[PDB]
Amino acid sequence: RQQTKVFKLVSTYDKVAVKNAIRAAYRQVFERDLEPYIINSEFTALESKLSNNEINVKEFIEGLGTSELYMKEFYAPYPNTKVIEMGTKHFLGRAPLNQKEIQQYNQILASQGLKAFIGAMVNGMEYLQTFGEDTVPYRRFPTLPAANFPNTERLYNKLTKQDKELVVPSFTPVVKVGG
Amino acid sequence: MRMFRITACVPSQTRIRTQRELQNTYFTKLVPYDNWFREQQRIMKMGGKIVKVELATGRPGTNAGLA
Amino acid sequence: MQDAITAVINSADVQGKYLDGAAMDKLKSYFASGELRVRAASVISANAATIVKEAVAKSLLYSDVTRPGGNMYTTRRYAACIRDLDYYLRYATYAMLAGDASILDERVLNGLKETYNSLGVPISSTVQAIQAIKEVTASLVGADAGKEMGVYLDYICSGLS
Amino acid sequence: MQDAITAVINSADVQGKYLDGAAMDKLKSYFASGELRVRAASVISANAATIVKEAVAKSLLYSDVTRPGGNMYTTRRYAACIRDLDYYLRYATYAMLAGDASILDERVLNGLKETYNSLGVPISSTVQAIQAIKEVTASLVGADAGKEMGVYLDYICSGLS
Amino acid sequence: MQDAITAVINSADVQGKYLDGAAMDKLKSYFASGELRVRAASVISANAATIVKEAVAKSLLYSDVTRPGGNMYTTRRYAACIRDLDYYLRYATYAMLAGDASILDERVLNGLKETYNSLGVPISSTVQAIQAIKEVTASLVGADAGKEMGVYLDYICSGLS
Amino acid sequence: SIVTKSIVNADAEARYLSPGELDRIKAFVTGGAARLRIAETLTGSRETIVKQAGDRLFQKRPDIVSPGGNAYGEEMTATCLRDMDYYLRLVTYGVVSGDVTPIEEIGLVGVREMYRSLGTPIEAVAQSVREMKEVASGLMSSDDAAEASAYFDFVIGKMS
Amino acid sequence: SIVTKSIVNADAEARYLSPGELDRIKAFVTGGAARLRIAETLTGSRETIVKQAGDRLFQKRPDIVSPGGNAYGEEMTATCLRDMDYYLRLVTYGVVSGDVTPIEEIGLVGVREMYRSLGTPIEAVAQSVREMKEVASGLMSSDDAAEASAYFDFVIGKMS
Amino acid sequence: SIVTKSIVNADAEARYLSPGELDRIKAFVTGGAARLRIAETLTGSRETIVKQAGDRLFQKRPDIVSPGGNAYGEEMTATCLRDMDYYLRLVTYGVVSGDVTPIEEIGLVGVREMYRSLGTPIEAVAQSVREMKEVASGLMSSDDAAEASAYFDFVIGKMS
Amino acid sequence: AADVVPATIARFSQLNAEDQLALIWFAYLEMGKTLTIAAPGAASMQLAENALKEIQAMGPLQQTQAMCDLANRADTPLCRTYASWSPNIKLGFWYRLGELMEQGFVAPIPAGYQLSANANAVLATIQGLESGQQITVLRNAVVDMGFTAGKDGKRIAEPVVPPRTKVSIEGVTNATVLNYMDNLNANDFDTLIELFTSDGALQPPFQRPIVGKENVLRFFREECQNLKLIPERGVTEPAEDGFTQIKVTGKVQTPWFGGNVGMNIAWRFLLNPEGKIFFVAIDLLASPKELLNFAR
Amino acid sequence: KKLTAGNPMNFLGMARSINPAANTIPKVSAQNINIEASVPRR
Amino acid sequence: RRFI
Ligand SMILES: *[C@H](C)[C@H]1/C(=C/c2[nH]c(/C=C3N=C(/C=C4\NC(=O)C(CC)=C4C)C(C)=C\3CCC(=O)O)c(CCC(=O)O)c2C)NC(=O)[C@@H]1C
Ligand SMILES: *[C@H](C)[C@H]1/C(=C/c2[nH]c(/C=C3N=C(/C=C4\NC(=O)C(CC)=C4C)C(C)=C\3CCC(=O)O)c(CCC(=O)O)c2C)NC(=O)[C@@H]1C
Ligand SMILES: *[C@H](C)[C@H]1/C(=C/c2[nH]c(/C=C3N=C(/C=C4\NC(=O)C(CC)=C4C)C(C)=C\3CCC(=O)O)c(CCC(=O)O)c2C)NC(=O)[C@@H]1C
Ligand SMILES: *[C@H](C)[C@H]1/C(=C/c2[nH]c(/C=C3N=C(/C=C4\NC(=O)C(CC)=C4C)C(C)=C\3CCC(=O)O)c(CCC(=O)O)c2C)NC(=O)[C@@H]1C
Ligand SMILES: *[C@H](C)[C@H]1/C(=C/c2[nH]c(/C=C3N=C(/C=C4\NC(=O)C(CC)=C4C)C(C)=C\3CCC(=O)O)c(CCC(=O)O)c2C)NC(=O)[C@@H]1C
Ligand SMILES: *[C@H](C)[C@H]1/C(=C/c2[nH]c(/C=C3N=C(/C=C4\NC(=O)C(CC)=C4C)C(C)=C\3CCC(=O)O)c(CCC(=O)O)c2C)NC(=O)[C@@H]1C
Ligand SMILES: *[C@H](C)[C@H]1/C(=C/c2[nH]c(/C=C3N=C(/C=C4\NC(=O)C(CC)=C4C)C(C)=C\3CCC(=O)O)c(CCC(=O)O)c2C)NC(=O)[C@@H]1C
Ligand SMILES: CC1=C(/C=C/C(C)=C/C=C/C(C)=C/C=C/C=C(C)/C=C/C=C(C)/C=C/C2=C(C)C(=O)CCC2(C)C)C(C)(C)CCC1=O
């Protein structure tokens, strides 16, 4: 929680910093450097826009989530339930909060697909309050609400492709409305 | 796709930040058409002032061929 | 956003003075109108979809706006127009409840005029649709509340020019 | 989350039944207890910081947990421990007002054991602290309200054990 | 972006008309050209790396552009210039396949001239490099297919200039 | 419920319930018997509220009970009155709770999906609830009707 | 069109059209004449197709043109038929372009919202297109019908 | 006030105010008369409230008005009384609006940074507000003082 | 080239204000027999609910004037409110008035009125149309009524006509009751009160007895406006202390306390041995009409 | 089986007692409608 | 449509 770096792109004059922010963005969203699973880079124009200050880090981050590469890595191999928790991990830094959030993103996936889901997370108020427009998302250590810390911990203590299991398949309800 | 180029000045309300913040305070950015309504609402709720909006990409009045 | 109370507070605070008799009167007047505003707000929320349905049928349907070549032609743009009106009515209701148009400046008239001019949305037709919303609401909430809702719907109309 | 009232409603809903006389008796019992719950809640909120301070003093301080190498040692961990005790008291107050513990199962206990066991937080020591909070708040709000708050603080402790 | 086909469809929809005789003649024209477009695209695709390499070699290398004080000097600038040329050829191919230049406006020229002027990217040298891509491409796809490609590479040049 | 609603509002801000919230709760518990009487009234006259309102609906919307209508035939007509019974019962839940969440969580979240899947014209459902609001209102004093109307209007405003 | 769709798919990967994207463009352009024929047969008998389709719809849904129905009354039946001609016109757009994008951009994005506001039962609008597909299928050879039906059915599916 | 808080909460969900929120607003405007009474009391007694509070504070904190103290000398001690008057005026704003928001936005965001820059012992500012609370609570009934206490306490709490 | 629907609408526009208004009323009567039924649920009639309350609250004279204003396009707030409504709402609004006219809540067309020669022919044309064509013509007949600021105007206004016997009772001939019933049906409260003692008391339907001349006087001014009560039969006897106890029954041809135009009523007159009334009881007799029933 | 709440059988008697009247068979004809001239103009 |  302390021994980390937060990539906050405060200027675009330093191209080395811009490139460092970009490569951190790839590592955050895709969980590692892209070279061993791309042929050629499909993000070059996106990097050009960020580097030219035409977009912000938030737009770059969403551009990564709506890319074909992201779809291949973290949508096609897994069911929509697991897509949700990997989504919040990569873009919000945490496991899903509650069943309402799982419901909310399950409807988006069921009706509009992957790009709508990414757009919902990154454009939400929580994202802007936490990471804002200029900061690459990063792992969080939420205290509240209940179970968010241990669920986020289980998500971030696994290596990529470590297993094919759901950390948060759904929150067991305490009171079944209607049952 | 159609895209807006928007300028906005978003102030700080509940904190006195010490890092440099100009980049996230007064900025100009490209927003996909399908995100502008939501994005405009978000900036407005954060107290932001939308100072300029332009249709950077696309044409007004298109019925077919939005990409 | 600021309601009628916070507006009176801000007027005194900018001058660094306590709330004097005139400011207390304004607070009293707002308090006394509270029941009427909450009544009108309850009526609008119950009929909000109906209000927009009938305002559109009265001001936009079966006209050049909705025929091919009109900005409201295509289901895509028709729905986009219906959404805008739906947001106008709800925000005019907030403004009426709060007794102050600041929420309209901040959450309606903040970049909206420039977005409309970029996309070619006709302001004239938008203002007429809003005016039709004002007519439809007055038939539902009465005259005293309908006049108040008209004040804030008019604020939006003139905000768009 | 479910309070005393929605517990009545839910029990009727799952059977698809309107509320009958017996169900209205349960709602009346809770309405009669409303004044006691509200008064206790306001006293606890106005004394929350002091309730925890005294609970910590008599249950945690000057022990292994506060000496170097201890879980409460370091200012961050001490501060986190006070914050956790603030949470338990605040959610017990929610539960006491609601007259229903379901909020504790949902917003407190869900994943709590896993959290503490992974961090090395001493479960017995936190249970002793909450029990100290139960004793302290009882001497503030009285036996009847103290025993009502005791149910929901004891509910948390039984969740952790 | 509208290809040639959608340009006709959109032109009819704004009128609310079915595809009339003239509209089908435009579609026929494009359907007849389609074989030439696809073949030329498949040739450019297989030789895009080569096409850019000779374009630069003939146009920019061993000149003051690549020498110290030139705008291609430094490996970062050289890579950026090469990247831009790769974009210009691939998008010209897109526009050539589609039969319309709208894709160039939406995905190439958006802010390009202002970017180049602010950064001091020499327009005249950039135009020569695109002309060089034109001449090399024409020698690979034949005269006629190189005439279409040249229209879209000329479109990019007009946007910059 | 009013208690749950204020608790979730307070928890969302990580704070104890405010004096304003605690005063609203105190008033609600102290006016409890008056609300339960309204709920008792609705419950006891549920047969006539649904029947009369259902009779009015089909007069107002004869198409729904014509060939090709969603409620055509006695059996489909029965399910429509059942649905009206569902929504009346929910209104009584809202009355005694002083909050709409029991109504929302049981019968308004996803209602558009449910009725579009069934082919039911949802706005006619809004009309059926509207009809129940008049019949119910005419069985009680104006002040009691106003308290129940708020919850009728919430259902109407959501489906419509 | 099929061309724009291919280009968008390729530009999403910052790469040139793959062999398959090129094959289908080549196949589509060679087939341009057959698509233009179907578009012409549909355009020629549009008046016949809609009016025959409308009568079949009414025999399926007599409620919509009876008191209380959305299309009740001469002017409303005429508007309903007007809408059937809209969606026939868009089906010809789909056929020639080889893509359902023109159909979505003009007449299926937000259609559910538009008809909600107007009170039209959208499933009956789906049935109307199901009728036009049947009537149109009889005016063309089986193969001209198989390609035309695909774009009708896309409208049917999107309106459920 | 609770009006803005309700609207802001309603606008986050792009919804109308629910019946419960409207009822809370109605109760708030009814209690407006009592809120105004308290604020008038504090405003009318402001000069005596600050003067006595200052005397009480200085006896408890002679260091601040001693040589080297931030408020040392007539000019500095008068400025310190002015700050106490500022926060009394803010507490009046909180009273009439029924919420601490005007207090937070005018006088508690960044308050530590400002006073630390001026060399003002923040705990002595917190003590002054405690003194004003004591004096003020003696000029009004138990209920009115309890009402006003929340705003006095809020200032103290944010100054710890 | 039939084009019946617009041609029929053209003929309606030519009828004078009176004929247009008379026509739609007689069209209302045919509804369900030769004309189409109404489906008010297909209109957003909540928009017209407030305007329909104002008309109901009007006096009989004002109500008819209100509807004449609609047909004459006079500039009144009701006509302005009317003009802002949608076509379906307008037609549904007129439908409600026709329903109330039959229910007696709103004043009727002049007694024994006859549809004019031209209007009857236009009606018959409508009668021969299909259902869908009928509603379209009906929609357009009323679409233009009320007041619209622009191109509008009618050649001739159609004012309402400017406009009391003794009531017979079977078995009862007491003058005190006779003056009351005639005075009541005449809305002459200034005279009807003089049949009640200064310490008299009245018992309205579904109410407790009200004791007091001024109270009973006020009640008449409030809940008995334009109210017609017909006694048909009764009986008179002395009961106690010389007081005479008459029980005359009948029917009420006007809505009253949830009653209908055809509800039977009863009076129990209790008047002094030497004259005027000390007490009276009025009780609407329940029957398959149970629309006046509350709950608890 | 004994009927339970929510079962529409519980409301069949109410449905039969209401006995709602269906609309008459419509006689509208698509072939006789001039679409262009009949669509409303506002 | 039958539910039986
Ligand atoms: C090469 C023929 C000439 C040249 C090029 C050059 N360009 C830049 C910088 C940028 N070029 C672009 C252009 C695009 N970005 C995109 O995403 C697309 C759309 C697909 C285009 C056309 C942009 C945005 C920039 C700025 C951001 C970036 O670096 O990517 C440079 C670098 C300038 C600098 O110092 O930063 C250069 C060198 N320069 C020449 O001299 C040639 C004539
Ligand atoms: C219908 C035949 C039965 C039924 C269904 C039911 N499901 C849920 C909730 C969820 N269903 C899913 C399912 C999936 N997510 C995926 O990614 C995949 C792969 C395509 C599947 C199948 C999920 C994740 C949820 C939770 C989120 C959500 O509700 O959107 C419910 C709701 C349960 C509740 O109380 O919340 C229901 C009712 N229920 C029956 O009774 C039928 C037999
Ligand atoms: C002080 C001498 C004067 C003064 C200052 C004042 N500034 C603000 C707000 C902002 N100030 C900045 C400036 C910077 N941010 C940076 O990152 C840097 C670059 C290193 C600079 C120079 C910004 C961006 C803001 C807005 C965002 C923020 O505050 O984080 C205010 C508040 C404005 C308001 O109304 O909110 C004030 C008061 N004001 C005076 O009157 C002095 C003369
Ligand atoms: C007929 C099968 C169904 C039906 C139709 C119906 N529609 C309307 C009114 C409108 N329909 C549209 C539709 C479109 N406009 C567009 O631009 C597009 C894409 C090309 C579409 C699909 C519109 C805009 C209207 C509003 C009127 C206007 O033209 O401005 C009506 C009339 C509703 C009313 O009350 O006015 C009807 C009857 N109704 C049915 O019941 C059938 C299932
Ligand atoms: C309807 C009365 C008229 C009309 C509307 C129309 N608007 C758009 C597009 C947009 N409208 C907005 C509006 C807002 N953004 C805000 O933040 C607020 C405050 C709540 C408002 C009202 C925006 C942002 C857009 C663009 C983004 C989006 O639509 O999602 C369109 C679509 C235009 C197009 O080319 O697609 C239309 C049709 N058009 C008319 O003709 C009516 C008079
Ligand atoms: C001395 C300058 C001031 C002072 C000190 C004081 N402290 C306590 C009690 C405790 N102090 C601590 C401190 C720490 N624990 C940590 O982990 C760290 C960092 C390593 C620190 C600094 C703790 C935990 C306690 C609680 C007792 C315990 O150790 O178990 C007291 C006693 C308070 C009481 O009532 O018990 C005192 C007196 N007091 C002053 O007034 C000086 C300004
Ligand atoms: C020698 C160790 C290897 C080698 C070299 C080689 N280089 C070129 C051509 C170019 N090299 C550069 C390099 C730079 N330009 C810059 O601005 C910077 C930063 C200071 C660098 C490093 C450039 C721009 C060129 C282009 C030619 C030109 O300058 O005009 C060649 C020629 C390639 C050709 O075919 O023309 C060669 C041979 N080649 C080897 O095999 C060695 C390993
Ligand atoms: C099916 C369907 C519907 C359609 C519903 C329909 C078809 C509704 C149609 C309802 C109709 C036909 C209403 C006509 C009412 C006429 C009145 C009240 C005239 C009063 C005249 C007076 C007072 C004049 C008196 C006079 C006086 C005073 C004189 O002095 C002398 C002259 C005169 C006698 C004139 C809806 C629209 C609801 C929704 C859609 C839908 O599907």
Tab-separated table of all heavy atoms in Angstrom, chain D residues 138-157:
chain	number	residue	atom	x	y	z
D	138	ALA	N	-24.038	0.902	27.985
D	138	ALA	CA	-25.141	0.565	28.876
D	138	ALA	C	-25.212	1.532	30.052
D	138	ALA	O	-26.301	1.957	30.450
D	138	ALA	CB	-24.998	-0.871	29.373
D	139	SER	N	-24.061	1.896	30.620
D	139	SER	CA	-24.025	2.848	31.724
D	139	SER	C	-24.354	4.264	31.280
D	139	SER	O	-24.496	5.146	32.132
D	139	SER	CB	-22.650	2.832	32.391
D	139	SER	OG	-21.729	3.642	31.687
D	140	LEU	N	-24.461	4.504	29.981
D	140	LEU	CA	-24.830	5.807	29.450
D	140	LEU	C	-26.306	5.903	29.089
D	140	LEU	O	-26.933	6.931	29.349
D	140	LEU	CB	-23.975	6.115	28.219
D	140	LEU	CG	-24.234	7.423	27.485
D	140	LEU	CD1	-23.895	8.602	28.367
D	140	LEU	CD2	-23.429	7.467	26.198
D	141	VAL	N	-26.883	4.849	28.513
D	141	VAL	CA	-28.250	4.896	28.000
D	141	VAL	C	-29.244	4.159	28.884
D	141	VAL	O	-30.451	4.205	28.598
D	141	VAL	CB	-28.330	4.345	26.558
D	141	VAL	CG1	-27.347	5.057	25.661
D	141	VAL	CG2	-28.081	2.846	26.537
D	142	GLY	N	-28.794	3.481	29.932
D	142	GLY	CA	-29.677	2.763	30.824
D	142	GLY	C	-29.706	1.273	30.532
D	142	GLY	O	-29.170	0.783	29.537
D	143	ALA	N	-30.358	0.541	31.437
D	143	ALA	CA	-30.397	-0.912	31.325
D	143	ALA	C	-31.246	-1.355	30.138
D	143	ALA	O	-30.837	-2.231	29.368
D	143	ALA	CB	-30.927	-1.527	32.620
D	144	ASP	N	-32.437	-0.772	29.980
D	144	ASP	CA	-33.327	-1.195	28.903
D	144	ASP	C	-32.705	-0.926	27.540
D	144	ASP	O	-32.611	-1.826	26.700
D	144	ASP	CB	-34.673	-0.481	29.020
D	144	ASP	CG	-35.490	-0.965	30.202
D	144	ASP	OD1	-35.193	-2.054	30.735
D	144	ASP	OD2	-36.428	-0.250	30.604
D	145	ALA	N	-32.270	0.314	27.302
D	145	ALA	CA	-31.595	0.618	26.047
D	145	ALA	C	-30.212	-0.019	25.996
D	145	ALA	O	-29.759	-0.429	24.924
D	145	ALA	CB	-31.503	2.128	25.851
D	146	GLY	N	-29.533	-0.119	27.138
D	146	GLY	CA	-28.253	-0.805	27.163
D	146	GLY	C	-28.373	-2.262	26.764
D	146	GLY	O	-27.515	-2.796	26.060
D	147	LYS	N	-29.438	-2.927	27.210
D	147	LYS	CA	-29.645	-4.316	26.826
D	147	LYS	C	-30.042	-4.438	25.362
D	147	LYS	O	-29.714	-5.438	24.716
D	147	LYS	CB	-30.705	-4.957	27.720
D	147	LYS	CG	-30.962	-6.425	27.437
D	147	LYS	CD	-29.665	-7.233	27.411
D	147	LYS	CE	-29.927	-8.735	27.489
D	147	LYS	NZ	-30.758	-9.117	28.666
D	148	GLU	N	-30.744	-3.439	24.823
D	148	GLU	CA	-31.070	-3.455	23.403
D	148	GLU	C	-29.825	-3.257	22.549
D	148	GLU	O	-29.629	-3.966	21.558
D	148	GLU	CB	-32.116	-2.385	23.095
D	148	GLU	CG	-32.854	-2.580	21.782
D	148	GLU	CD	-33.417	-3.981	21.607
D	148	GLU	OE1	-33.816	-4.599	22.614
D	148	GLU	OE2	-33.456	-4.466	20.458
D	149	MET	N	-28.971	-2.299	22.916
D	149	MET	CA	-27.693	-2.161	22.225
D	149	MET	C	-26.812	-3.376	22.457
D	149	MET	O	-26.033	-3.755	21.577
D	149	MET	CB	-26.974	-0.896	22.688
D	149	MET	CG	-27.330	0.352	21.894
D	149	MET	SD	-26.866	0.262	20.158
D	149	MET	CE	-25.086	0.318	20.258
D	150	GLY	N	-26.933	-4.006	23.624
D	150	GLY	CA	-26.156	-5.198	23.894
D	150	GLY	C	-26.451	-6.325	22.927
D	150	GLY	O	-25.559	-7.103	22.588
D	151	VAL	N	-27.696	-6.423	22.461
D	151	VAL	CA	-28.053	-7.480	21.518
D	151	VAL	C	-27.235	-7.345	20.241
D	151	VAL	O	-26.695	-8.326	19.721
D	151	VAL	CB	-29.563	-7.446	21.216
D	151	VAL	CG1	-29.890	-8.353	20.038
D	151	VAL	CG2	-30.365	-7.850	22.434
D	152	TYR	N	-27.128	-6.125	19.722
D	152	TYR	CA	-26.529	-5.919	18.411
D	152	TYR	C	-25.012	-5.820	18.473
D	152	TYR	O	-24.342	-6.134	17.485
D	152	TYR	CB	-27.142	-4.678	17.775
D	152	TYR	CG	-28.632	-4.843	17.636
D	152	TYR	CD1	-29.508	-4.136	18.444
D	152	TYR	CD2	-29.159	-5.750	16.731
D	152	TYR	CE1	-30.864	-4.306	18.334
D	152	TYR	CE2	-30.514	-5.926	16.613
D	152	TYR	CZ	-31.363	-5.203	17.420
D	152	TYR	OH	-32.718	-5.375	17.304
D	153	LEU	N	-24.452	-5.392	19.606
D	153	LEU	CA	-23.010	-5.500	19.785
D	153	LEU	C	-22.613	-6.944	20.054
D	153	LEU	O	-21.595	-7.420	19.547
D	153	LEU	CB	-22.548	-4.586	20.918
D	153	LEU	CG	-22.577	-3.095	20.585
D	153	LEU	CD1	-22.611	-2.272	21.860
D	153	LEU	CD2	-21.395	-2.704	19.725
D	154	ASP	N	-23.422	-7.657	20.836
D	154	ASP	CA	-23.198	-9.081	21.038
D	154	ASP	C	-23.376	-9.853	19.740
D	154	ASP	O	-22.734	-10.888	19.539
D	154	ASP	CB	-24.154	-9.605	22.107
D	154	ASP	CG	-23.769	-10.978	22.614
D	154	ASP	OD1	-22.759	-11.082	23.345
D	154	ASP	OD2	-24.473	-11.954	22.285
D	155	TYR	N	-24.251	-9.374	18.856
D	155	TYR	CA	-24.400	-10.009	17.552
D	155	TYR	C	-23.107	-9.918	16.751
D	155	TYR	O	-22.678	-10.899	16.138
D	155	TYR	CB	-25.553	-9.366	16.788
D	155	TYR	CG	-25.974	-10.151	15.572
D	155	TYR	CD1	-27.028	-11.044	15.635
D	155	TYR	CD2	-25.311	-10.001	14.365
D	155	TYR	CE1	-27.418	-11.760	14.530
D	155	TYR	CE2	-25.691	-10.716	13.253
D	155	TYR	CZ	-26.745	-11.594	13.342
D	155	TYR	OH	-27.126	-12.308	12.238
D	156	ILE	N	-22.473	-8.746	16.750
D	156	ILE	CA	-21.191	-8.589	16.070
D	156	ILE	C	-20.159	-9.533	16.668
D	156	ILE	O	-19.456	-10.249	15.949
D	156	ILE	CB	-20.721	-7.129	16.149
D	156	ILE	CG1	-21.614	-6.241	15.287
D	156	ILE	CG2	-19.264	-7.022	15.729
D	156	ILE	CD1	-21.535	-4.789	15.633
D	157	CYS	N	-20.059	-9.553	17.997
D	157	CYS	CA	-19.051	-10.381	18.648
D	157	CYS	C	-19.249	-11.849	18.312
D	157	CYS	O	-18.280	-12.566	18.043
D	157	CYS	CB	-19.095	-10.173	20.161
D	157	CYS	SG	-18.496	-8.573	20.691
